[PDB]
Amino acid sequence: NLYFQGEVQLLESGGGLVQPGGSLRLSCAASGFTFSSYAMSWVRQAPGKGLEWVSAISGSGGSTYYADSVKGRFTISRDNSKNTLYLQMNSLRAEDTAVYYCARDLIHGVTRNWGQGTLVTVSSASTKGPSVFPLAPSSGGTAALGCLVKDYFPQPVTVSWNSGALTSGVHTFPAVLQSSGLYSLSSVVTVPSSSLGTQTYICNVNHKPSNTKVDKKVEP
Amino acid sequence: NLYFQGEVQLLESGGGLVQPGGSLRLSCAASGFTFSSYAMSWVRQAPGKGLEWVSAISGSGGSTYYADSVKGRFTISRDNSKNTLYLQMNSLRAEDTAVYYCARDLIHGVTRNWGQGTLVTVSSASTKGPSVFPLAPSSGGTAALGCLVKDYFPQPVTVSWNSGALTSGVHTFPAVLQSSGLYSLSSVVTVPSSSLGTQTYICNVNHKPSNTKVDKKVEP
Amino acid sequence: NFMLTQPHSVSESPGKTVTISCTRSSGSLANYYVQWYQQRPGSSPTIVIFANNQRPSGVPDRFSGSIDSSSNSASLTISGLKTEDEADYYCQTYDPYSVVFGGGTKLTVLGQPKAAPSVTLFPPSSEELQANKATLVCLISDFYPGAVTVAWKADSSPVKAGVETTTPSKQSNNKYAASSYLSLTPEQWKSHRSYSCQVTHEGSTVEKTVAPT
Amino acid sequence: NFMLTQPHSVSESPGKTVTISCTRSSGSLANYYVQWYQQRPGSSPTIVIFANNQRPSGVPDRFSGSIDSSSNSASLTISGLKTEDEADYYCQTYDPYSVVFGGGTKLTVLGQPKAAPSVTLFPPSSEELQANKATLVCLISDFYPGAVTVAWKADSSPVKAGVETTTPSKQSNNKYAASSYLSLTPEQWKSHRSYSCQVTHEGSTVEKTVAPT
Amino acid sequence: IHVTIPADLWDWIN
Amino acid sequence: IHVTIPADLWDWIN
Amino acid sequence: SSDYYDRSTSPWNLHRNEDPERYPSVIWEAKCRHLGCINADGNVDYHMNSVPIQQEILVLRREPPHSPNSFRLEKILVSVGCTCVTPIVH
Amino acid sequence: SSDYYDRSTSPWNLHRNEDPERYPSVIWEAKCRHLGCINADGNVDYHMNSVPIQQEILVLRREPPHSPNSFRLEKILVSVGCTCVTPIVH
Amino acid sequence: TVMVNLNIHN
Amino acid sequence: TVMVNLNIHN
């Protein structure tokens, strides 16, 4: 290896919600290596599914490769002066819904490093910030309390407690996909019973896809 | 092969007589191929001996190779703009006496084409043009007559008859190396007996090493 | 184009050796380098093997690649198996134009101890009933294996309408969590005497009951 | 540096197969390409085989190269042998710095017919005696095999002093030529009654005699 | 005549 | 200033 | 003037880039023939790749195009030839 | 900006050619590491050769050296990288 | 001789 | 602006 463990850095951006037929551009900022001398790839993973290769480009950008499923709709490109990889996606379809990963290739087809991924959602459904309901403690010395984060679209939602001051005993549950197309999740925290009355417990709900931040006080 | 049989042409010049310790430069004019992309070699053959590799150079001239026997005394070089290969030979010794061949190499050590060769003679002995003696016919209808080309140095001598008009029946014999260091050879021609008296038989002796041309009339 | 086929699941106990095959249809496997990736839940894939048998700086000698042309297949072997090796494994190769990933193999390290589920049931909040809606929240956690059955009851009578249940997922403590929701009308909630979440795990059932004020 | 060793001579009849070995001392032969050259009398070497077994456009299928690492040697084989194949053969290879030629193998096609030698003896010219020197010229030609014995006599008595003889050489007609010279004083020439060149070929002796005016 | 040269070259000229 | 350029470039200028 | 483009294990083709607005007017750009490299048996091997070798060069342009009085000296990138790269470094 | 020099089967080293009398002042010249090429097993193979790829480039010189008022635009030859060539063409 | 107005670029 | 005297080469 020409590079030590951890020096290659790949950071994707540009994912989001788009309607069928829509367009979106993914960006991948690279560092820790001589970008212009590496072939780069895009790989995706639909939620609960396997990895699927999307596209590839040579170091110079002179050669491009595409999976049959995206040919004529997607365009891979790069700016070697900006150390950035791109993916312009046109006529987007429900099947394109995935986490898209940026990849460094030693030669065409030998992927050596992966990015963090960026989520692309193709749906006719409008973005919707959640409705936050407190889940009040009641009937051990330990009380369970939470927040019901109801009817949001698309994923993801982030749940924190007391602006991140409360991290222990927090259990944020994976979301349920309702028949409606909307998601719901729950975040619970176990606290001493004696602290109810003395302490204020607030769940901070962040839904970046709709720019919604909601703080709900959870009372006994 | 990138080249057809006969297109690669290699023509050496610069051989001659030099004294021990002397200097001489060989040239090899190339054609029929992209000279700058080929490694070139010098190979020699002492009279009556095997081939002996002397030196090599890469296409660019950036790398040079020499046999142990010539290291520090010879320098290979090239002018890629003139399609010419060179060999500068310094502190020349009796052991360097040979026919030197120019060679085209596919890669270092894979010689694919040879030049015509150029003769290098290292000796303390002075150049000496020959003394030409007629070898008069006497005792079938066929008379043998010739020329004795005596005491010349170095090789070679060329013998022609009647300025090249008489070529059939001519037998020019390989030279004898006398104990003196001087060479001698004989050229004989078989002619009809009836032509003696009517025809004038002249041997044209050329010894380029001493710039000597001698024409001897051979009479009955 | 072509495809790579690998088993869906592979199982073995700690210290023992597992092997994941990856068979190529179109083209000769020996003509193209085969890569192996490890993928942890909610994480980016990491490289385990590149160029048939090369290990990146940091991957243990336990992991090793091999290729076999007499079957057109590549293999990933994991000797001296640990609990940390539990993940999803993908093989990858290419042809002169395409790049193809295998379907993935899910690795299971057998021997892990059974865990009873922790069930907590929440009735609808006052804020929600005010919005003229009602949701019962059943949260199941700390269970192993991740196979659970959720059944809802109103008083004593069963209910299949308005129930949405998640698929189990691995937690940070290598145990499983799930959740089930009952969307009711405030009228359905206010009419019944109580409601109960029944969760079955390896034959044993754990129940939680809530009542309208 | 290193060296290549090949036999000095190789013999076979027409139509039959010959093989020339070339053994390398220092270094592995299989790591470097081996070349084969043909060299005709008074001619530049021509390529027969390059890169172990490649034939240049124009070289017959009769010629073929092979290499054998279990002996560190290269071979040149010539099947369906013709009289035109009679020449000197050189193997050539290299290491990362040096280029080395083998000592050469001389090829002989057996079956060629015996030829009696044609001897012509010339006494000294008047121009030469005028220069106060004397040379007798014995020219031997059209003989096969190229093994000849030259012995000079003054009247009947032998003479070993002042005799210079060439080594036989191949002619255009594939037969041999030689020449012998007797450097005398005009006094030695003018004193004797006659002089004779005796040339022996395969047991039979052919003599030529000249006399001073 | 009007000639445009890189800033790089202008630095070298000084 | 005095600038020397290839004959090649001078041909292109015309 | 050179035949490396044909003798290389990563061989290339020369493409004429013609522009009368710049000096030099014609630049011959290397374009790799294959994705892989020609192996020891004359076959395209995909365990390696042919990649172009680029060089930044100075060029003179008529800036703006066709105009007589003004010109601009600028650096451009050009493909010179191809090399063979492997994923394994030794 | 590029690591092909290290990943190539015909790898090279960059040599700084420093001359304050010309623009560009520093030119990095490719010098081949080996005579042969790194084969499929990581070993130097002499059945092939590493050769430099040369490109003619325009450079500006202070002609005569150090002088302020005069300059000369000329073409020079530079080694850009190395390629791998074989005696057998397929 | 000719009149040359030279400007930089960035 | 500056005075430029430009000459060829061969």
CSV table of N, CA and C in Angstrom, one decimal, chain B residues 84-173:
chain,number,residue,atom,x,y,z
B,84,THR,N,22.5,8.9,-36.3
B,84,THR,CA,23.8,8.4,-36.4
B,84,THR,C,24.3,7.9,-35.0
B,85,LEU,N,24.9,6.7,-35.0
B,85,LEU,CA,25.5,6.1,-33.8
B,85,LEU,C,27.1,6.3,-33.9
B,86,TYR,N,27.8,6.5,-32.8
B,86,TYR,CA,29.2,6.7,-32.7
B,86,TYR,C,29.9,5.8,-31.7
B,87,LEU,N,31.2,5.7,-32.0
B,87,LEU,CA,32.1,5.0,-31.0
B,87,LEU,C,33.4,5.7,-31.1
B,88,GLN,N,33.8,6.4,-30.0
B,88,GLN,CA,35.1,7.1,-29.8
B,88,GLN,C,36.0,6.1,-29.1
B,89,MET,N,37.0,5.6,-29.8
B,89,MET,CA,38.0,4.6,-29.2
B,89,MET,C,39.3,5.3,-28.9
B,90,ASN,N,39.7,5.4,-27.6
B,90,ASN,CA,40.9,5.9,-27.1
B,90,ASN,C,41.9,4.8,-26.6
B,91,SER,N,43.2,5.1,-26.5
B,91,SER,CA,44.2,4.2,-26.0
B,91,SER,C,44.0,2.8,-26.7
B,92,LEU,N,44.0,2.8,-28.0
B,92,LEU,CA,43.7,1.6,-28.8
B,92,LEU,C,44.9,0.6,-28.7
B,93,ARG,N,44.6,-0.7,-28.7
B,93,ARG,CA,45.6,-1.7,-28.5
B,93,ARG,C,45.5,-2.8,-29.6
B,94,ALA,N,46.5,-3.6,-29.7
B,94,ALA,CA,46.6,-4.6,-30.8
B,94,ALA,C,45.4,-5.6,-30.8
B,95,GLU,N,44.9,-5.9,-29.6
B,95,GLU,CA,43.7,-6.7,-29.3
B,95,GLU,C,42.4,-6.1,-29.8
B,96,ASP,N,42.4,-4.8,-30.1
B,96,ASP,CA,41.2,-4.1,-30.7
B,96,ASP,C,41.1,-4.2,-32.2
B,97,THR,N,42.1,-4.8,-32.8
B,97,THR,CA,42.1,-5.1,-34.3
B,97,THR,C,40.9,-6.0,-34.6
B,98,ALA,N,39.9,-5.5,-35.4
B,98,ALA,CA,38.7,-6.2,-35.8
B,98,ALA,C,37.9,-5.4,-36.8
B,99,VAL,N,36.9,-6.1,-37.3
B,99,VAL,CA,35.8,-5.6,-38.1
B,99,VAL,C,34.8,-5.2,-37.0
B,100,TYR,N,34.3,-3.9,-37.0
B,100,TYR,CA,33.4,-3.4,-36.0
B,100,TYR,C,32.0,-3.3,-36.7
B,101,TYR,N,31.0,-3.8,-36.1
B,101,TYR,CA,29.6,-3.8,-36.6
B,101,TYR,C,28.8,-3.0,-35.7
B,102,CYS,N,27.9,-2.3,-36.3
B,102,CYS,CA,26.8,-1.4,-35.8
B,102,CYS,C,25.6,-2.4,-35.7
B,103,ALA,N,24.8,-2.3,-34.7
B,103,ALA,CA,23.7,-3.2,-34.5
B,103,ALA,C,22.4,-2.5,-33.9
B,104,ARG,N,21.2,-2.9,-34.4
B,104,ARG,CA,19.9,-2.4,-33.9
B,104,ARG,C,19.4,-3.4,-32.9
B,105,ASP,N,19.0,-3.0,-31.7
B,105,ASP,CA,18.5,-3.9,-30.6
B,105,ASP,C,17.0,-3.6,-30.4
B,106,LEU,N,16.2,-4.7,-30.3
B,106,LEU,CA,14.8,-4.6,-30.0
B,106,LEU,C,14.6,-4.1,-28.6
B,107,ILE,N,15.4,-4.6,-27.6
B,107,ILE,CA,15.5,-4.3,-26.2
B,107,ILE,C,17.0,-4.5,-25.9
B,108,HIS,N,17.6,-4.0,-24.8
B,108,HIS,CA,19.0,-4.2,-24.5
B,108,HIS,C,19.2,-5.7,-24.7
B,109,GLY,N,20.3,-6.1,-25.4
B,109,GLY,CA,20.7,-7.4,-25.7
B,109,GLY,C,20.0,-8.3,-26.7
B,110,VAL,N,19.0,-7.7,-27.4
B,110,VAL,CA,18.3,-8.5,-28.4
B,110,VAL,C,18.6,-7.9,-29.8
B,111,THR,N,19.8,-8.2,-30.4
B,111,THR,CA,20.2,-7.6,-31.7
B,111,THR,C,19.4,-8.2,-32.8
B,112,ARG,N,18.8,-7.4,-33.6
B,112,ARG,CA,17.9,-7.6,-34.7
B,112,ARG,C,18.5,-7.3,-36.1
B,113,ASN,N,19.4,-6.3,-36.2
B,113,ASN,CA,19.9,-6.0,-37.5
B,113,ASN,C,21.4,-5.6,-37.4
B,114,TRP,N,22.2,-5.9,-38.4
B,114,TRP,CA,23.6,-5.7,-38.5
B,114,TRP,C,24.0,-4.8,-39.6
B,115,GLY,N,25.0,-4.0,-39.4
B,115,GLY,CA,25.6,-3.1,-40.5
B,115,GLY,C,26.5,-4.0,-41.3
B,116,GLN,N,27.3,-3.4,-42.2
B,116,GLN,CA,28.3,-4.0,-43.1
B,116,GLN,C,29.6,-4.2,-42.5
B,117,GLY,N,29.9,-3.5,-41.5
B,117,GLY,CA,31.2,-3.6,-40.8
B,117,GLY,C,32.2,-2.6,-41.3
B,118,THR,N,33.2,-2.2,-40.5
B,118,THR,CA,34.3,-1.3,-40.8
B,118,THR,C,35.5,-1.9,-40.1
B,119,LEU,N,36.7,-1.9,-40.9
B,119,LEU,CA,37.9,-2.6,-40.3
B,119,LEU,C,38.8,-1.6,-39.6
B,120,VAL,N,39.1,-2.0,-38.4
B,120,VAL,CA,40.0,-1.2,-37.5
B,120,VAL,C,41.3,-2.1,-37.3
B,121,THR,N,42.4,-1.5,-37.6
B,121,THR,CA,43.7,-2.2,-37.5
B,121,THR,C,44.6,-1.4,-36.5
B,122,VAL,N,45.0,-2.0,-35.5
B,122,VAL,CA,45.9,-1.4,-34.5
B,122,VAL,C,47.2,-2.0,-34.6
B,123,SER,N,48.2,-1.3,-35.1
B,123,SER,CA,49.5,-1.7,-35.3
B,123,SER,C,50.5,-0.6,-35.4
B,124,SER,N,51.8,-0.9,-35.0
B,124,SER,CA,52.9,0.1,-35.1
B,124,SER,C,53.4,0.2,-36.5
B,125,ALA,N,53.0,-0.7,-37.4
B,125,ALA,CA,53.5,-0.8,-38.8
B,125,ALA,C,52.8,0.3,-39.7
B,126,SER,N,53.7,0.9,-40.5
B,126,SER,CA,53.3,2.0,-41.4
B,126,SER,C,52.5,1.4,-42.6
B,127,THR,N,51.6,2.2,-43.1
B,127,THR,CA,50.9,1.8,-44.3
B,127,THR,C,51.9,1.7,-45.5
B,128,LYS,N,51.6,0.7,-46.3
B,128,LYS,CA,52.5,0.5,-47.5
B,128,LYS,C,51.7,0.0,-48.6
B,129,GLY,N,51.7,0.8,-49.7
B,129,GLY,CA,51.1,0.4,-51.0
B,129,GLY,C,51.9,-0.8,-51.6
B,130,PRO,N,51.2,-1.7,-52.4
B,130,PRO,CA,52.0,-2.8,-53.0
B,130,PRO,C,52.8,-2.5,-54.2
B,131,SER,N,53.7,-3.5,-54.5
B,131,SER,CA,54.5,-3.6,-55.7
B,131,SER,C,53.8,-4.7,-56.5
B,132,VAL,N,53.4,-4.3,-57.8
B,132,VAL,CA,52.7,-5.2,-58.7
B,132,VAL,C,53.6,-5.7,-59.8
B,133,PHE,N,53.7,-7.0,-59.8
B,133,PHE,CA,54.5,-7.8,-60.8
B,133,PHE,C,53.6,-8.6,-61.7
B,134,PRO,N,53.8,-8.5,-63.0
B,134,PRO,CA,53.0,-9.3,-63.9
B,134,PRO,C,53.4,-10.8,-63.8
B,135,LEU,N,52.4,-11.7,-63.9
B,135,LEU,CA,52.7,-13.1,-63.9
B,135,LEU,C,52.3,-13.5,-65.4
B,136,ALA,N,53.3,-13.5,-66.2
B,136,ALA,CA,53.3,-13.7,-67.7
B,136,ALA,C,52.8,-15.1,-68.1
B,137,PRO,N,51.8,-15.2,-69.1
B,137,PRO,CA,51.4,-16.5,-69.5
B,137,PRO,C,52.5,-17.3,-70.3
B,138,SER,N,52.5,-18.6,-70.2
B,138,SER,CA,53.4,-19.6,-70.9
B,138,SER,C,52.8,-21.0,-70.7
B,139,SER,N,53.7,-22.1,-71.1
B,139,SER,CA,53.3,-23.5,-70.9
B,139,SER,C,53.8,-24.1,-69.6
B,140,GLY,N,46.5,-26.1,-74.5
B,140,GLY,CA,45.1,-26.4,-74.1
B,140,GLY,C,44.0,-25.5,-74.7
B,141,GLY,N,44.5,-24.4,-75.2
B,141,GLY,CA,43.6,-23.3,-75.7
B,141,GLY,C,43.3,-22.2,-74.7
B,142,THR,N,43.7,-22.5,-73.5
B,142,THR,CA,43.5,-21.6,-72.3
B,142,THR,C,44.8,-21.3,-71.6
B,143,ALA,N,45.1,-20.0,-71.5
B,143,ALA,CA,46.3,-19.5,-70.8
B,143,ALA,C,46.0,-18.9,-69.5
B,144,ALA,N,46.9,-19.2,-68.5
B,144,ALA,CA,46.7,-18.5,-67.2
B,144,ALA,C,47.7,-17.4,-67.1
B,145,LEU,N,47.2,-16.2,-66.7
B,145,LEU,CA,48.1,-15.1,-66.4
B,145,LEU,C,47.6,-14.3,-65.1
B,146,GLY,N,48.5,-13.6,-64.5
B,146,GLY,CA,48.1,-12.9,-63.3
B,146,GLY,C,48.9,-11.7,-62.9
B,147,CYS,N,48.7,-11.3,-61.7
B,147,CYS,CA,49.4,-10.2,-61.0
B,147,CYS,C,49.8,-10.6,-59.6
B,148,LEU,N,51.0,-10.4,-59.3
B,148,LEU,CA,51.5,-10.6,-57.9
B,148,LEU,C,51.6,-9.3,-57.3
B,149,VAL,N,50.7,-9.1,-56.3
B,149,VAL,CA,50.5,-7.9,-55.5
B,149,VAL,C,51.2,-8.1,-54.2
B,150,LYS,N,52.5,-7.6,-54.1
B,150,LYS,CA,53.5,-7.9,-53.1
B,150,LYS,C,53.7,-6.7,-52.1
B,151,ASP,N,53.9,-7.1,-50.8
B,151,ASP,CA,54.2,-6.3,-49.7
B,151,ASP,C,53.3,-5.0,-49.5
B,152,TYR,N,52.1,-5.3,-49.1
B,152,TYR,CA,51.2,-4.2,-48.7
B,152,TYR,C,50.8,-4.4,-47.3
B,153,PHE,N,50.4,-3.3,-46.6
B,153,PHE,CA,49.9,-3.2,-45.3
B,153,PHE,C,49.1,-1.9,-45.1
B,154,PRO,N,47.9,-2.0,-44.4
B,154,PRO,CA,47.2,-3.2,-43.9
B,154,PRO,C,46.3,-3.7,-45.0
B,155,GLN,N,45.4,-4.7,-44.7
B,155,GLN,CA,44.3,-5.1,-45.6
B,155,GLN,C,43.3,-4.0,-45.7
B,156,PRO,N,42.5,-3.9,-46.8
B,156,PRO,CA,42.4,-4.8,-47.9
B,156,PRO,C,42.9,-4.3,-49.3
B,157,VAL,N,43.1,-5.2,-50.2
B,157,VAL,CA,43.4,-4.8,-51.6
B,157,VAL,C,42.3,-5.3,-52.5
B,158,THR,N,42.0,-4.6,-53.5
B,158,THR,CA,41.0,-5.0,-54.5
B,158,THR,C,41.7,-5.1,-55.8
B,159,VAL,N,41.4,-6.2,-56.6
B,159,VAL,CA,41.9,-6.5,-57.9
B,159,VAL,C,40.8,-6.6,-58.9
B,160,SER,N,41.0,-5.8,-60.0
B,160,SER,CA,40.1,-5.9,-61.1
B,160,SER,C,40.9,-6.1,-62.4
B,161,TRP,N,40.3,-6.5,-63.5
B,161,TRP,CA,40.9,-6.8,-64.8
B,161,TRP,C,40.2,-6.0,-65.8
B,162,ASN,N,41.0,-5.2,-66.6
B,162,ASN,CA,40.6,-4.4,-67.8
B,162,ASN,C,39.5,-3.4,-67.4
B,163,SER,N,39.7,-2.7,-66.2
B,163,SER,CA,38.8,-1.8,-65.6
B,163,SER,C,37.4,-2.4,-65.3
B,164,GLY,N,37.4,-3.7,-65.0
B,164,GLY,CA,36.1,-4.4,-64.7
B,164,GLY,C,35.4,-5.0,-65.9
B,165,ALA,N,36.0,-4.9,-67.1
B,165,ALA,CA,35.4,-5.4,-68.4
B,165,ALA,C,35.6,-7.0,-68.4
B,166,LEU,N,36.7,-7.4,-67.7
B,166,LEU,CA,37.0,-8.9,-67.6
B,166,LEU,C,36.7,-9.3,-66.2
B,167,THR,N,35.6,-10.1,-66.0
B,167,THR,CA,35.2,-10.6,-64.7
B,167,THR,C,35.2,-12.1,-64.6
B,168,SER,N,34.9,-12.8,-65.8
B,168,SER,CA,34.8,-14.3,-65.9
B,168,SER,C,36.2,-14.8,-66.0
B,169,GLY,N,36.5,-15.9,-65.2
B,169,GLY,CA,37.7,-16.6,-65.2
B,169,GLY,C,38.8,-16.0,-64.2
B,170,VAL,N,38.4,-14.9,-63.6
B,170,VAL,CA,39.2,-14.2,-62.6
B,170,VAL,C,39.1,-15.0,-61.3
B,171,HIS,N,40.3,-15.2,-60.6
B,171,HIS,CA,40.4,-15.8,-59.3
B,171,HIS,C,41.4,-15.1,-58.6
B,172,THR,N,40.9,-14.2,-57.6
B,172,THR,CA,41.7,-13.4,-56.8
B,172,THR,C,41.8,-14.2,-55.5
B,173,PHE,N,43.0,-14.5,-55.1
B,173,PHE,CA,43.3,-15.4,-54.0
B,173,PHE,C,43.5,-14.6,-52.7
